[PDB]
């Protein structure tokens, strides 16, 4: 897997003894979609 | 350091063996023990 | 007579050449110990049996090279 | 001297030594050490500068001493005491995770963070 | 009177009075002299805790703890430069060595069976060399009976033996030109390192004796 | 501090043992062979 | 005879070969501290595989050594 | 005759040194395995027969060694 | 003459010394075999041809070493 | 005889000189396998280096040969 | 009686032979030991006893080849 | 005239000892071209002049055992 | 004799030989030291009495060799 | 007269021997070169008189041995 | 006379010495040039510890052609 998600992944695990504040929770927790696009034709927006 | 050859083998060998037997009896019940006895004391000390 | 004993104690010589490549051997664990332990320094306690191990067995065909040359000196 | 910087915070941005872990096993830097690109694996670092010394937990990142003794530190987020036992409960959750499951890359990455949480 | 007989007697009252006139006040913080063979009794504790891994790991503890210390005082008193070395009589250092082998393959037929030579069975591999990968075993098996003797006994006797031969010649060489034993120093020192590295190579044997006969008990507890 | 402790050697140590006394017998025809000169 | 004299040095010679299991195992060793201080986690694959790689070492120095007892006791 | 004897013994002693190469020569291709097996972590399965191949082919070398070694020594 | 058979004997043991290096060679070539093919993984179509050919020609240094034993010896 | 005697042994001598010739071989290819796997591409340059390597490496234990030669033929 | 006196100085210098391996051997602790302490810095604390161990062992080797050259040369 | 002789071919012999250094030796030249030129690739033009010189030289010290072989001849 | 006066001649020659090894091993140290501090200027000041120290045990074993190289030239 | 003739020519080869570690020498300061050089793409106008220093110096090695040689055999 | 001939065998024996002098110098070359190559700019405080590198490794060299000579010349 991509190097940068390999360190997302880890970072999110790493914010849990949990203590954090909301923004440390938030740069590792925030929900979003994708939607791929085409050359026109969408595949639809699926959850990030 | 000079040493030959001796014929003496088993002479020296029954007081070898001898003093494996004796230490290995004295440690393992006599002194060994006194060693756990120090530990757990310690021990029992430190949770009373 | 003479030939025979020279004999003994060149046989003896020689053999002493292949302690050598133990000494060598028990070097290289060594210098792969330390390697080790630099690039992980928790790997240490694991490693340590199998250094040892090592070095044992190197150290020990060197043993057996010095056993032909004691049949020799002291025989 | 020594850049140390988080998105949103900067931890330590003339620094003597710094222990690192990074893909070339461990790293120590010292004073000067010749110019490196290394990628910091995720991390327990320690920082010190002068005699004092500061005790991380590192998401990992990339290292970078730059010719001019700048060492660039990035990484994404930290102190060890942040970090530091409800984890240590979460990641054997994460644990029964990797046996069903890019998921199952991710669980077997908490099971690296686990190795990780075990060096504390 | 026997010579080696002598000797054992005088590591046998050197070992009591270190476990009885070592801490004779009981102190619960110990007596200084005794943590020292508190450091050792918790880093072979630990260590035969460790390779062992059976429930006999500290069943066997008293022996090899009493392979450690055998070895290690006398690998003291026979550094002794008027003491007679127990070690110059090999045969029973060498007869412990094949007991202890013997003592292993008897355990490992009594845990294991007489399918203990299984244990010489390593892995499945092509079928031509199934046997082979038994004989390899089997010699190494043995050549584990007198390795280990041997390795100590090489070490002892070389150090006293190498240091009564340059001792000697450093002697004769103080004779001939006297000059010589002026600033005769330096092959004194010379002495001296080896010395201090028979010392070390006598601690270094004692705990290298009973980490190697926890590995060979490893084996012999549970099938490799 | 010194006290008795039993360990069952008899079953414990048993091969160890066994093993010595056969050394003990092999070395004393071992002896008497190295005798003889 | 020249022939007794030939036997003990023949031995001699012979027991040089064990100096190249010396080498040998160590280079087995090494390589297993090196894999696993790379890995943390190859060493149950590994360690049989180290045993059998060191197995075969330390044989060509008993060769050599086998050959030295039938010259030398032979 | 016997000096023709003792050449045969001798000649086999000296015979005896080559096999050292071939001994350190199967370390070399195992040491390759650990290290190749470290490096994939999944290379495996194709190099674990690959390697008893180079074993064979490295050990080969040490055993037409012998084989002369031998015909000088019985022979 | 005796020392003339003799000294084919000694002269045969001599060149079966030069088998070393082919025992180290062999290992070499596949030593590199496997460090090469757990580095690239994919390269070892080309490169398992390219390893057979470095193990011949080292392989063949060895047997020139064999045949002037044998050529000593057998004649 | 003596003369005899010394061609036979003189080219086993000679036969010694071949070993390094055989080491270095294996080291050119050696090179080779870990210059293409690094590289992939680098093989269509390097692949004529390598043979001209491997003839010259190769050469020195020819000489060794050529030495062993002449003594035996004489 | 001349043969075997010479014998007994011959033997030394072949005994000599195996000091060698000894002396490479330390540099290979030393030289590990270097490029190590240069990775990490800090190491060195648990390191640099190891490196002791490493040396000692290495040498008692060499010493065993002193012995025998010793036990030729002087008796 | 035998001894003479005897010990110019045992001498000769011997001699064949100094060369195998340089076989190694040529070896380690070119692969160490071929290491060098498959990091950089691009140096490879300017590296074998340099490769060649040190080829030479390599292979000279062996040259030098050989010729006073074929004297001893 | 002519026969003892030789052989401490050529004995002396052989225990010469093993000097040898401790040149190689000085300079493994010191290639060490080189790379070392290229890779970390500032850790030289630690570093080199490691240095300095590796080169002396390397060389006592040189030493020892010498010694008895020195025997049997001038006992 | 034959002996003390056949000694040198003997001795001539024995001295050809020392040769090869410098020929080895030559190789390694070369290997250096190529490797630096090929680091850099430009060290080599400063590296080039440092590696014709190194190999001056493992060439003078050789030589010594080499007029050992000459020595003997030119008288 | 044997005593001469033995001076000339003893003094060949000896020049063997010297190979593992000459393998010295060039490792730390060797590593001059990787270091040089590592850092550009080692340079100032190597160049005396080179010197001194090279002076030791041709040392143990000259202590074995000193015997050399006085077997050889006397």
Known sequence: ISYAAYLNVAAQAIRSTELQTASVLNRSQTDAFYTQYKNASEPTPITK | MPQLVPFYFMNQLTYGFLLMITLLILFSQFFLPMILRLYVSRLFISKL | MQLVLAAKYIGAGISTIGLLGAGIGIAIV?????????????????????????????????????MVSFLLLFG | KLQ????????????????????????????????????????????????????????????????????????????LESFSENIKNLLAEAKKNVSSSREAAEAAIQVEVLENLQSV | LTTFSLYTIIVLLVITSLYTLTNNNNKIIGSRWLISQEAIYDTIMNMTKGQIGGKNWGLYFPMIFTLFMFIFIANLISMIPYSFALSAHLVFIISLSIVIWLGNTILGLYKHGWVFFSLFVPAGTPLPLVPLLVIIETLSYFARAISLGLRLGSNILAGHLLMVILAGLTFNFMLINLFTLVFGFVPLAMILAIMMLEFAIGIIQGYVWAILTASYLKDAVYLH | MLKRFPTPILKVYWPFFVAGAAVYYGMSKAADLSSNT
């Open chain 4, 4 to 79: 140390f910087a988080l998105p949103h915070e900067t931890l330590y941005s003339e620094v003597t030594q710094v222990n690192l872990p990074a893909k070339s096993g461990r790293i120590g830097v010292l004073a000067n050490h010749v110019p490196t690109v290394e990628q910091l694996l995720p991390g327990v670092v320690e920082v010190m500068e002068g005699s004092n010394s500061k005790k991380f937990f590192i998401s990992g990142g990339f290292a970078t001493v730059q010719p001019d003794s700048q060492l660039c530190v990035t990484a994404i987020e930290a102190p």
């Open chain 3, 30 to 66: 060594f210098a792969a110990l330390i390697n080790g332990v630099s690039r992980n320094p928790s790997i240490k306690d694991t490693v340590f049996p199998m250094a040892i191990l090592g070095f044992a067995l190197s150290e020990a065909t060197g043993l057996f090279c010095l």
